[PDB]
Design a binder for this molecule. Structure first.
Ligand code: HEC
Length: 104
């Protein structure tokens, strides 16, 4: 996945919702500053969802891959904003940024 496209994709998809970096605040999306290497239904002092805890997985591309292109599949009680990312290609690029970004 391209980190460069990934960066822009994140900014062109999520941006005013997630941060994936330090000091990302707590608007709607949790500041995803440690996605790749944590379990679900947990966050540093942030209002989480039950449905996420109900997932009980490890975030590692392979998992988010469905979530970003199937927000009403894993569990029918998310936020359901749209279909999903454009396709797997974009998803991959997105992840490529994310892998770094979340871990700085
Ligand atoms: C707000 C308008 C959001 C947009 C746009 C995107 N996301 Fe999101 N995301 C949001 C919330 C409130 C949450 C928590 C829901 C939950 O499952 O408890 C999330 C969660 C994620 C996760 C899982 C991390 C976790 O909370 O356990 C991932 C991997 C994620 N979001 C990725 C993601 C990406 C890459 C987006 C743009 C392509 C995106 N989200 C948009 C809120 C919002």
């Amino acid at each position: 996945g391209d980190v460069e496209k990934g960066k822009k994709i994140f900014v062109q998809k999520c941006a005013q919702c997630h941060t994936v970096e330090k000091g990302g605040k707590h608007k709607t999306g949790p500041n995803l500053h440690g996605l790749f290497g944590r379990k679900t239904g947990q966050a540093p002092g942030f209002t989480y969802t039950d449905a996420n805890k109900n997932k009980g997985i490890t975030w590692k591309e392979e998992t988010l891959m469905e979530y970003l292109e199937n927000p009403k599949k894993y569990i029918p009680g998310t936020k359901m904003i749209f279909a999903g990312i454009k396709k797997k290609t974009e998803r991959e690029d997105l992840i490529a940024y994310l892998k770094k970004a979340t871990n700085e």
